[PDB]
Chains A and B, each alone.
Chain A
Amino acid sequence: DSMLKTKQSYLKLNSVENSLNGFSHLFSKPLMKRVKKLFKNQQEFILDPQYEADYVIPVLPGSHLNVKNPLLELVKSLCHVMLLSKSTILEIRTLRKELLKIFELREFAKVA
């Protein structure tokens, strides 16, 4: 929805294309707060016995990745889908670094 809004605004105004440039500015802070809340809740309710139902990793044919923290893969997918822009790469990289700063990880780690 944000991408549609920014493209519509750019069109109404008239390897860079200002149709999309500047779309992550709409939801960065709410995303940061939501990621913080998710991390806190996962930290609190991961080793509980009755709350272990929703943290079970699904298994599907062709899967080969053994992973531990589901929130890491959530944010990794949410950032890799963003990283397909090929024109707003710097903004996406800055957002990815800010998200990774919530975890105690670094920018170029293999786990990230």
Chain B
Amino acid sequence: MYYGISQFSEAYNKILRNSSSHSSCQLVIFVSCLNIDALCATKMLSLLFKKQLVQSQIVPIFGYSELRRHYSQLDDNINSLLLVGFGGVIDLEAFLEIDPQEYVISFRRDIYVLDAHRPWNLDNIFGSQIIQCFDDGTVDDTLGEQKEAYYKLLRKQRKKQIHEYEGVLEEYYSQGTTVVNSISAQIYSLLSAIGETNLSNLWLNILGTTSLDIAYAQVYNRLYPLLQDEVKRLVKTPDTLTLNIQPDYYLFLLRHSSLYDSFYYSNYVNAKLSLWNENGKKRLHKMFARMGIPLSTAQETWLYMDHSIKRELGIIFDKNLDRYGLQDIIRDGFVRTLGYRGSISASEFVEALTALLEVGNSAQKLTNLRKRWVSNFWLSWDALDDRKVELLNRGIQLAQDLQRAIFNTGVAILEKKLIKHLRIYRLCVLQDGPDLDLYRNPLTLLRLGNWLIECCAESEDKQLLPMVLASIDENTDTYLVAGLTPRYPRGLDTIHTKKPILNNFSMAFQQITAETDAKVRIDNFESSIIEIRREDLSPFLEKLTLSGL
């Protein structure tokens, strides 16, 4: 590894020696837009560098074209550069035509790349001195064999060693993309090693960790005890600030919407009870009647909801959920209270942030969309501070609206049975429908796909197949295709979790595009999301059917 866990501080010191100045901006940070963990890490770094009065600039970027153009724009004055949320999986030097002899003097510049994706470019570490990254503890133990082959490959019977090295490199490659650690977690480890921990840093670390609950529950479960222990280690006065471990549930905005809607819109409850048809609603009404909460009482705001039932809700759930089999909905979460404002949970706050990112405020229209996205990112960033709450109530109401729209589209999809079951991978295309303009956002498409894959997993089928989802943008006449990984049921043991399910869609797309002159545009930081032509979708599809996945 380049920078181990114990070396962070040392590297940090170097930054000061190259950036701490009186009247010169010598530090620029590029952030992976449309990502919560990157936003939390950027906030923590901004606070850190505002403490010691180190001048800096924050620049959001969306695509690799923007990254290349912005790097080409930069001047030689910038000694230190930060790249948070991307860059691990590709070789920057080849992309950025970096000449080490041009930057020898050594260490003319410094580029610190900080990413969480686990399959990363081996040459980027073992070949280059200018580029350096913060390892999470993977190179030391996992790559004890690949490095030997790379070092050896960097009298006629000696070709056996070359063949073995080539085979080892090939075996290391052709692996799916996954995430195994958190950027905010690494930054908080650095902060704990330095000695600048406090409540704001703990809150941001909690947000960054809990942003992965939907997709990387294994990482979340591996990392949770550290957060619990750290929170334990660290009169209602109008200036109090409380962080506690309160029971919480897999519910959609429980403390801001009625309990009926909370049960209605919850993805896990939907998957377990089939609420898209009438039998689901009948079962929900049976549930409510047997618990004993009146239907008129359960349809009121959580503030005015009955105090006694609010107190005994835990016992009611414990005694009633076993028959319906929802006993996996109860978990432990973090709750933050400040004075007389109210109570917010981490899940609710991250859903509000995600929805505020989603909604707020040919090539030219694509550029306009991308600048709208970066403006939404900045507005979401501004919403972080405690002095603004009209930028969070709006986010909560927009989250409610977006979840309603997603539910309305998913029920129609499941009615129409558009999910075609092929031999290898499932496929569905949203050819026509209402409010299809909302799905031009990749994060909204991922939300819809997450709900669909949860619904598919919560069935009796014994086939784990990748799912392909596509949409339409009639103005551009292009399909937005995103590949989705299969997921195990949330109520499963750890023995069948030897390795998380990988994603081969990026490899398949790149191979097809490199062997066939298709009219696509692969520039998103997510390598499994592409834009394809309406006329070019199908042939491409058959190609993907005929290619080794």
Is the Cβ of B517 less than 8 Å from the Cβ of A46? Answer: no
**What residues on A are CB-neighbors of B542 within 8 Å?**
43-44
The residue from B517, B539, B543 contacting A49, defined by CB atoms under 8 A apart: B517
Q: Which residues of A contact B539 (CB under 8 A)?
A: 43-44, 46-47
Query: What residue of chain B has the Cβ atom nearest to residue A42's Cβ?
Result: B539
CB-defined contacts of A68 to chain B, threshold 8 Å: 535
| Interface range, B side | 10 to 19
Chain A residues with Cβ below 8 Å from B518 are: 47
- A52: chain B residues at CB < 8 Å are 517
CA distance A46 to B542 in the complex (A): 12
Do the beta carbons of B543 and A47 come within 8 Å of each other? yes
Is residue A14 within 8 Å, beta carbon to beta carbon, of the partner chain?
no
Chain B contacts with A in 512-540, Cβ cutoff 8 A: 516-518, 535-536, 538-540
Closest to B516 in A: A47
Q: How far is the CA of A49 from the CA of B516 in the complex (A)?
A: 7
Query: Could you tell me which residues of chain A, from 53 to 79, have a CB within 8 Å of some CB in chain B?
Result: 68-69
Minimum distance in angstroms from B535 CB to a CB of chain A: 5
A52 to B539, CA, bound (A): 14
Give Cα A43 to B543, complex, Å: 10
A69 proximity list for chain B (CB < 8 A): 535
CB distance from B515 to the nearest CB of A (A): 9
Please give, as numbers and ranges, the residues of chain A lying within 8 Å of B517 by CB-CB distance: 47, 49, 52
Residue count of chain A within 8 Å CB distance of chain B? 9
> Residues 35-52 of chain A: 1 if any B CB is under 8 Å from the residue's CB, otherwise 0?
000000001101111001
Interfacial chain B residues near A48, Cβ < 8 Å = 516
Chain A residues near B535 (CB, 8 Å)? Answer: 68-69
Chain B hits for A47, CB < 8 A: 516-518, 536, 539-540, 543
Give the distance to chain B from A1, nearest Cβ to Cβ, in Å. Answer: 35
CA distance A75 to B102 in the complex (A): 61
Rounded to whole angstroms, the CA-CA distance of A46 and B519 in the bound complex is: 12
For A46, the chain B residues whose CB sits under 8 A away are: 539
A112 to B132, CA, bound (A): 57
CA distance A69 to B540 in the complex (A): 15
Centre residue among A43, A46, A47, A69 by max chain B CB count within 10 A: A47
**How far is the CB of B460 from the nearest CB of chain A, in Å?**
31
> Chain B residues near A43 (CB, 8 Å)?
538-539, 542
Which residues on the A side are within 8 Å of B536 (C-beta)?
A: 47
Look across to chain A and name the residue whose beta carbon is closest to the beta carbon of B534: A68
A52 to chain B: closest residue by CB: B517
Closest to A49 in B: B517
Which residues on the A side are within 8 Å of B543 (C-beta)? 47
CB nearest neighbor in B for A48: B516
Shortest CB–CB separation between residue B420 and chain A, in angstroms?
13
Smallest Cβ distance from A33 to chain B, in angstroms? 20
CB distance from B63 to the nearest CB of A (A): 24
Please give me the residue from chain B that is nearest to A104 by CB atom.
B431
Chain A stretch 3-55: residues in CB contact (< 8 A) with chain B: 43-44, 46-49, 52
Near A by CB (< 8 A), chain B positions 94-135 give none
Cα–Cα, bound, A52→B516 (Å): 11
Once bound together, how far apart are the Cα atoms of A46 and B539, in whole Å? 8
B residues 132-159 touching A (CB-CB < 8 Å): none
**Distance, CA A68 to CA B516, complexed state (A):** 18
Q: In the complex, which residues of chain B have a beta carbon less than 8 angstroms from the beta carbon of A44? A: 539, 542
What is the bound-complex CA distance between A90 and B453, given in angstroms?
A: 47
> What CA separation (Å) do A48 and B540 show in the bound complex?
11
In whole angstroms, how far apart are the Cα atoms of A46 and B275 in the complex?
44
**Residue on A nearest B542 in the bound complex, by CB:** A43
Interchain nearest-CB distance for B227 vs A (Å): 50
- What's the least CB distance linking A66 to chain B, in Å? 12
Contacts of B538 in A (CB 8 A): 43
A46–B537 Cα gap in the complex (Å)? Answer: 12
B542 to chain A, nearest CB (A): 7
| Complex CA–CA separation, A61 to B540 (angstroms) | 33
Cα of A46 to Cα of B540 in the assembled complex, Å: 10
Task: List 16 contacting pairs A-B, 8 Å CB cutoff, sorted by A.
Answer: A43-B538, A43-B539, A43-B542, A44-B539, A44-B542, A46-B539, A47-B518, A47-B539, A47-B540, A47-B543, A48-B516, A49-B516, A49-B517, A52-B517, A68-B535, A69-B535
Interface contacts beyond A43-B538, A47-B516, A47-B540: sample of 16 additional A-B pairs, CB < 8 Å, sorted by A: A43-B539, A43-B542, A44-B539, A44-B542, A46-B539, A47-B517, A47-B518, A47-B536, A47-B539, A47-B543, A48-B516, A49-B516, A49-B517, A52-B517, A68-B535, A69-B535
In the A-B complex, the 5 residue pairs with the closest CB atoms: A68-B535, A47-B539, A47-B516, A46-B539, A49-B517
